[model samples]
Target: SMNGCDGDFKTPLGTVETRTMTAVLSPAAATERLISAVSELKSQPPSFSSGVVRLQVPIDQQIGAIDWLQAQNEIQPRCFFSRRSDVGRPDLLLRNLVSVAGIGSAVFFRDLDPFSHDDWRSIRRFLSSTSPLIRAYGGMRFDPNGKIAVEWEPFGAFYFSVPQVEFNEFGGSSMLAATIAWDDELSWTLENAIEALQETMLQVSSVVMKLRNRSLGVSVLSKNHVPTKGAYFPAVEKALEMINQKSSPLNRVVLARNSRIITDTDIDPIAWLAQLQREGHDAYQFCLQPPGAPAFIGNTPERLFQRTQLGVCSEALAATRPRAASSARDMEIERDLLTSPKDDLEFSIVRENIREKLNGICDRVVVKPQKTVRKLARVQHLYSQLAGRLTKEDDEYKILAALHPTPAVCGLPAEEARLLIKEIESFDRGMYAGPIGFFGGEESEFAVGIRSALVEKGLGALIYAGTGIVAGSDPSSEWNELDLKISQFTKSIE
Candidate 1:
C-alpha cells in the first residue's frame, strides 16, 4: 500500500521489528548539506532528535559514501554489500519493501536498550505474513550470490538498533525500503576491460617501485556462470529472511549482480565498469569461484577504507570464516591466517590506498605492519590497522571520499586496475563493493559490503566475492582464496 518515489510496492508475507525507514538521495554535496541541516535543526527553539538516519548510494558510489561517512564520524560502524549474481531488480522494483536497521543512539560504542519482546513477535508475524513492505536492512547478515560476490566477513556499519513496532501488511504505512540503488551512465567492452587490466598491472608496478618502503599486496578473482532470464524475487526475500534469522543484534547489507538483460535494474556493474573505462575512471574486476561448488562469481569496483587511533587500516578480506571442511582444516586455516601472505596482502593494499588518498588531507599518516584479528560467526581474519591525523576542518564525509575504494577490495593502482576489472572480468560490481553504513548525527561509520548479497526480482539473488591478486598471483590460487572468502555465508544458510 505504501507507494515510494519510484513505484508501487508489494511484499510477500514477512515481519520486521525495527525502527522507521527513510530514503534520501546522496545530495550532490552530502557533508555540506548534512552539516548545514544538522546545525539548523539544533538551533530550533524546542530540542528535537532524529531517531536514526539511513541512506544508500547507487551501487557505483557505495565505496565513495563509506569513505566520506567514516571520515565524518569516528563512531560510525562500517558496512557494505558484495555483488551477487542471483537476484534481479526486486529491490528496485519493490524498493518500498527493503528494511533499514539502526539505533538512534548518540554515544560512540555503548550497548543500548533492547527491543521489547512484543516488538520482536510483531516483526516475526509480519515478516511471515503475505503483504507488501520494504525491509531496509540495518544490521542484517550479508549474502554473496551474485554474478560476482565477495567472501563474507563480520562487518558493522553502525551500532545495531533495537526493533520497533512492525509495519502492517495493508496501508500507506505498510511500506518497507526493500532496496537501495543509484544510476550509472557507463558501460564496457570486453577489449576495453582487458586493456584496463593490463594498464593497472603497469601502474601498480610503478607504485611498488616508487614506494619501496611500504608493504605491498594485491588480489584478483573471477568466476564464470550462465546468465539467467527474468528476475528472482522469492529467492531474494528468502535470502533476506534467512539473514535476519541467522544474524541477531547486527545489521547486514547485501549486493547482488544481474545481467542488464534480466532485471533491468539500475546501475549494471558490467555497464558501469565499462563506463569507468570510457571516462577513464581506472577500475578493474577480480573474478574468482568457490571450490567444489559450481563456479561462483563476484567483483569489487572499489576498496573499503578504515581509520583508527593507530593510523590507516587496510585489508581486502571478506569471508564466511568457517567452511564445510574438517574442523581441523578450519582451525589450521584460521591459525595459518594470522601470518598468511594473503591476509597481509589484503590489509596492505588497503593501507597504501588510504595513505595515498589521505596524504593531503591529514597532517601525518601512521601505519604499522601489524595485523588485527577480526572474527565473525563463520570465519576469522587478520587485518592491518592504520591511522592519520586530520589536517583540515572538514566533517567525516569529506575525508571518506578521498580514502574510498582502497586497494584491498578494488586492487592496487586503483584506477587502472578498475578498468581492467571491467574488461577481463566478465560482469560489473555495482554496489557490491560499495559501502553501507549509518550516519549518527555528526558521526558515522561505513563498511565496504564485501561479504554481502543483492536481490533484485524476488527469485533472483546474486552472491558476490572477490580476491586480491598480485603481479605473481596464480589464477587458480586466487580462485581458492575466493572460496575461503565466501565459505562463511554458505554455512549460515542451514
Candidate 2:
C-alpha cells in the first residue's frame, strides 16, 4: 500500500510465471505468453477467467494530469480526475480503446440507480484489490429516471471505465500506467483484456505540451440559456410556491438552469479545464468525456462523500454568498450569511439530512463547528463536516446514495423536491449536479457537480448552476444568484 510513498509495505502479489505483475517494458507485444500462463490451469472450457492486469513505469519528473492530457488530447475516449485537494493523492489521466462485449469493462457505460444493490455490486466488481489505483472513473445523470433530452443521450444514466492507458501524478513523482479488467460472468476472458491492452499500449505517450501561462485566446461567440436568463425568475417563483405550500413536504428545492456558450474558437476541453484549475485552487476539478461526446467538467466545492477503508467522511455545503470587492464588505457579507435566518433554514436542511443519513450507516457520527464558512474564489458557502467509522460492511455505495442530493442540490425530503424540480425545469440537467468522481478500493471520494459545464468541441459549452429555494426565497434575488454562479465561466471566456 505504501509502495509509492515508502519502503515498508508490499502487496503479497509480486509475480506470475516469473514475470512481475508490475511489468515495466513489454510494450505493444502480443500477450500470447502471458495469456497461456494465466489460462493454462483451466484446460477444459467450463468457463472463461476474469482478472485485472496492471502495468506501470515511473516517470522521472513531476507532471500534472492536465499537462499530460494536453499532450495527448488527440486521443478520444480520454478522461481526467484531479488529485483530491488533500496531499499525497495521485491525479489520473486515462484513455480507453475498446470495451470487451461482456465484462465489468462493459459496465463502464451502464446507468446507475444508487438505490439498486445490484448496480452497486456490479459497479464495484470492475475494481480489483490488485492495486488501489485499479478503480473506475465516471459519473451519472442527475436524475437517472428523468426524461433524457437528445443532447444528454450519449451519457446514458451512468458511466465508469477502467482506462487501458493512464498517466498518474503523485508526490514529486509521476507514472504512466495501463489497466485491463475482465469478469468471467460477463464472459470477457483474461485473454480479451490482454489482447485489448496490446494496441492500447502503443497509444500511450510520454511528451507533454503545456500552455505555460498562454492565454485561452477563445472568446464567447455567443451565449444562450435554455429557460433564458429571464425565465429563472418564474422557475424560482414556482419552487418557492411549492416549498411554502400547505400540502408540501418540500422545505427546500434547488432549481438549476444552464447557459449555452458559443466560443469563437474550439474549446480544448482539457485546456479550458486548465483555466478552471487555475481559478479553483481548493476545488475538486474533473472531466469525463466519453468517445465522440461533449466533455463534462466541473470545479465543484461541494463534496458528496469520501469513503475510506472502514471509515466515512462527508460534508454539508449550502447557502451561498458572493464575495465582495473589499475586505470589510466581504466580512459584512460573511456576517450576514452566518446570521441570516433564511440562509440558516436552507443550510440546516442540508446539514441535518446528511447527519441522519450517516447516522444510519456509521457506528458513531460526529460533527464540528455545527456550521462555518468555506470561502472560494468567487463565492462562499455555509459548510459543516460529518465523519464516522462504518458499522456496516462495504457501505460505500449506500453512503453515496444517501448523502447525494443533500438539500443543497435537491431539497429536504429529497424525493419530493426532485420530482418537483423535474416538473418545474424543462431542460435536462445531464451530469450537472451529479456526483462526479472515481471509486478506489482503499478510498473513494465524490464531488457534487454543481459548478460544472458540458463542452461541445467546435460548438460551445453549456454551463449548469442552481440555487436552494426555501420559504421566503426572493425570486429576483435568487435569479441574480444564478447569474453570480455562472459569471465565473462567462468572465473567463471573455
Candidate 3:
C-alpha cells in the first residue's frame, strides 16, 4: 500500500497505490511547484525511453488536485474531467485524462440486466446479428482476463474494455478499462492531454460565439448502421419489429485487429461543436478517449436521465430538426414537433414508461412542462428532465439497475419497443446508445452513448450511430439524421 503525495488512496487488484502528489506553497512557490512538476517530466530523459512511460496515477484527493490545477493559468488547459455523481457513481473518483487534437465530453446510461448472463448474451447476440449492414466497426469480446474488450474492425484503434479494479484483499470493482494510443510518442500524448484540459476554455469561447455570431448550437451526427441481409431487413419490418427481432440488432461479433494504432482522422471534435452551433444546431463533442487514446466525437440532441437523491430525472425527446426551404417552412416543422400528436404521444409514452419502471424504486417524481427547442443539432419534441431519489441505496449497482435502455432510445411502451428493436434495427446497439461515463465509488454520471464512434485497427475503422424509433418516425428522415450524426466525426479528418 503505497500512498503517493496526496492522501487519497486506491487499491486496484489488492495493490494500494496513489497516483497524485501534493505541494504546499504560497502563490509564488506554487507557481514553482507547477513549473517543477511540468519541467521535471519535460527535462528528464523519457522514463520509458525503451518505449513510452505508461504510468497510471491514482491520487486520493482528486477534487483537490483538479482545483489546484485549475487555479494555475499558465499550465494550459486541455484535460477531460469528471466527478463521481456526474457519472451516477457513489465514490469520489476524478480522472484528468488528456489527448492530442481530439477532445470531447460525453454523458448517458440506461438500465439493463447487470447480473444476468442472459442479458449480456442477448446484447452480444444482437451485435453478431447485424454483421452485414454494419460496415463492421469494432467487435466486442469477453477476454480471458475477465474483461470486456471491444476491438475495432479492419484496424484503427485498439482495445476498449471494462477492467476490474481490485479494492482490498477480498475483492475489487470493475472499471471501464481502455488501451488506446499508449505507444504514441510522449509529445503527442502530452498535447492530447492538454487539449482535454483546455475544454473549459472552449466552453468560454462558445458563449462568445453565441452572442457575437448569433450562432445557435447545432446537432451533429455520429452515424452507424446495423445492416441486415436483403431479406433480413424485411423480416425485421413490423410495427415494433425493431425491438425484438434477433437479426435486427446483432451483438457478439469479431474482427481482425489487435494493436492500438490510431487512424481515421475525419472528426474534429471542437470545430464540429463550434460549427454546428453557428448552423443553428446545438453542437456538443463527447470524447470517449481515456488518457493518451485518440477520441470518439459525436453531437447528440437528447438528454437521457439525470441522477439525484431527489429522483431519477429523465427526458422525452422525439422530434427531428427542421429541414425546409424557407423560414416559414422551418417554423411549421418546429410547430409540428411542438404540437404533433405523434411526437407528443411518443414523448409522453417514454415519460410514463420511465415512471412506471421506477415506480417502487423512486419515492416522489416530478414532471416538468414540455418545451419546443433545439438541442445541439436537432429540434426535439417535448423536452423535460426528470429527478427522483432511489428508495434503495444509491450506488453504481442501484443506478445501473434503475436507469438504462430507456424508452427514449429503446421506444415507447418499453417492453414492446425492446422486442421490436431486436426485430427491426439492423445492428446491435452495443454501447453505441448505451451508457458511457465514470462511476465514482459513491456517485456517478452515466451518459447515453450517442453521437459516438467505435475505433480499432484493421481494414477500415468502423463507427456506429443510431436513433430512437416511434410510430410516425420517417425511415428515410431517420436514416439521414443518422448520417448527419456520423459526419460530426467524419469532418474531423481534414
Candidate 4:
C-alpha cells in the first residue's frame, strides 16, 4: 500500500505497485536496488496488477545513457534520442539507452496506424507530466501507405516501444529507471510485464562503461546508390522540369537518394551517432535498432514540430550555405542566404506551407523574424520558427499528420511528390526523411530523418540525404548537396 495503486481494478494481492524510487542512488547502486525490488515483487504473494510501473533512482553525477547502452552485453530492442540544443529554449538530451512496450508493425508488422488515436490512449495512460521522462520512443516510416522495400520489411509501416529499462541523463543529474506497462485488454498482463522486466533487468549492466567514441574504422568494400550516382542529376532535372510545367501544381519537390555503403567491418551505430553528436549543431541525433532489424540513426535539423501545453513550435528549414567558415565570410554568406531570392523562394515554400497548415488548426499563428540561419556541422540552413496556439489540445494528432510531409522534406503537392519519389528512387525510404522523436512531457518533438543511415553488419550503412528542387535548381548543386548532407556520416565513417 506504500506505493500508490490504481483504483480501477481489484487484485488478490493488495499491493499493485505503480510508483517506486530511491533518493539519488548511484548508477551501480540503483541497479542493485532495482534488481532486489523486482525480486521482492516476485516473492510477494500472488499480487495481480495492471497498468505501468516506474521504478527509478535519481542519480547525482552526470552518467552517460548512450555509453551505458553501448556497454550492454546484449541488445534488447533499444532506441536513443539525444539533443543538446533546441529552438526558443536551451537544449535537450540524455534520452534512453529499451522499448518493452511497443506499437510495432502490426501496431508488430496491420493497418500500421502509427500516430493513431486508439494507439495513443495506451501510451497516454502510462504518461503523466510528473513522470515526464516516462515516454514511448518510436520510429515510423515516412510513407506508411506506400510500398515497402525488402530491407525495410522488419521496420514495417511503423514501430514504437516504451522503454522497460531507461538510463536517462537530464537536468545535471541522471536517471536510472526501470519502466514497464501492461494492459489486460492488450493481453499484456501485469504478471507477464514484471517477468519481462525481470528478464530486462538481468541483462542490464550496473556499471557505466566508457563510450567507444571513435571512428567505426570501417573500410569501404564498395559504394552503390539506389539510383546510381549518374541518375541523381536526371532526378533533379525531372523535378525542375516538373516544377516548370504550368499545370503541374508543384512549386518544390524534395528528392532523396540512398548510398548503400558496404563495409568490411560491422558498423557501430552508436559510435557513429556519437561522432555526429560531437560535430552536430541545431539538430537531433537519434538511433533505433529494433529486435531483428538494422540500426537506424540520424543527425537531422528539420523540426517537423514540437508540441507544448498551448502552442506548437514548427520550423521551415530549407536551403543551405556550405558549412560555417571565416566569421566575416560566414556573415557575408549569411547575408547572401538572407537576401538570395533563389534560396528565399525555397524557404518561402516551406515557410508558407507550414504557416498554412498551422492556420488551419491553430487559433492564431505567428512566424517572427520570418527568416534566419541554422548552422549545422555539415551545412547551414535558411531557417524560420512557426509558432501557434492549438484550437483544441486533442488536435495534436491532426497537427502531426498535417505538418508532416512539409514542403521542407517532401514538396508542395505532397501526394504527387510521394508518387514521383516512389517511381524515381529504387530503395524504400523506410524511416529516412521520416519524423523520429519521442512522445512525452509537456513537449513531444519530432525531427525530420534526413542525413541518416541504416546500419546492418552486412548491408553496412545505407546513408540518406535529400534536396529541395524548386525553380532555378541546378543538378550539380543538388547532387553535391547530397554529398554535403552525407559528408558528416562519411567523414565520421573512416
Answer with 3 or 4, whichever has the higher lDDT: 4
**Residue-level lDDT tens digits of model 3 in 1-494:** 01011111121111111222253323333333333443444455243211111112222221222222223222111222221112321221112221111112211111211323332222222111111110001111111112223431211111122111100000121111111111122232433432332343222211111222322233223332345233332433444344345544421111111111134343333333334333423222333443333334344444444443334555545555545557787677778777777676656666666666555466665555544444343333456555556664333244445556665565544455555545444343444555544333223345565655544322223555555554444455655665555654455432
Residue lDDT tens for model 1, 300-320 = 222343332223333334322
Estimate the TM-score of every prediction.
0.39, 0.84, 0.51, 0.88
| Local lDDT at 331 for model 3 | 73
Candidate 4 ranges beyond 4 A from true positions: 1-18, 43-49, 87-115, 324-329
Clashing pairs in 4: 83-92, 98-163, 103-107, 104-107, 105-108, 105-109, 106-109, 106-110
Q: Candidate 1, which segments miss by more than 4 Å at Cα?
A: 1-350, 372-382, 392-395, 487-494
After superposing candidate 2 on the true structure, give the runs of residues whose Cα lies further than 4 Å from its correct spot. 1-48, 86-109, 112-115, 183-187
What are the RMSDs of all candidates, in order?
Answer: 23.3, 7.7, 14.0, 5.0
Kindly list the per-residue Cα lDDT of model 4 for residues 1-494, writing each as its tens digit.
01111222222222223455665547788778888877775676243445455677767767766676776654546678875366463221114321112111111111344545554543454566666666767667888877777777777666665666777776567767775555554565667667777876777776667665575777988887767778888877877777898767777787888888888888888778877776777567888777777888888877777787667878787776675567887788778888998888778877898898999998888886588887776567788777888875667777888877787777877878877887787778888888788777456777788878999967688999888777887888778778888988887786
C-alpha local distance difference test of each model: 0.31, 0.67, 0.35, 0.70
Q: Residue 300 of model 3: what lDDT?
A: 48
- The TM-score obtained by model 1 is 0.39
Candidate 3 deviant stretches above 4 angstroms: 1-237, 240-285, 289-297, 308-312, 321-326, 370-374, 391-396, 412-416, 423-426, 458-460
Residue 461 lDDT in candidate 3 = 34
The residue-by-residue lDDT of candidate 2 on 18-85, one tens digit each, is 11333333222213333433344224322324445555555445567677667663544567777446
Q: Give the candidate number with the greatest TM-score.
A: 4
Error of 2 at 209 (Å): 2.7
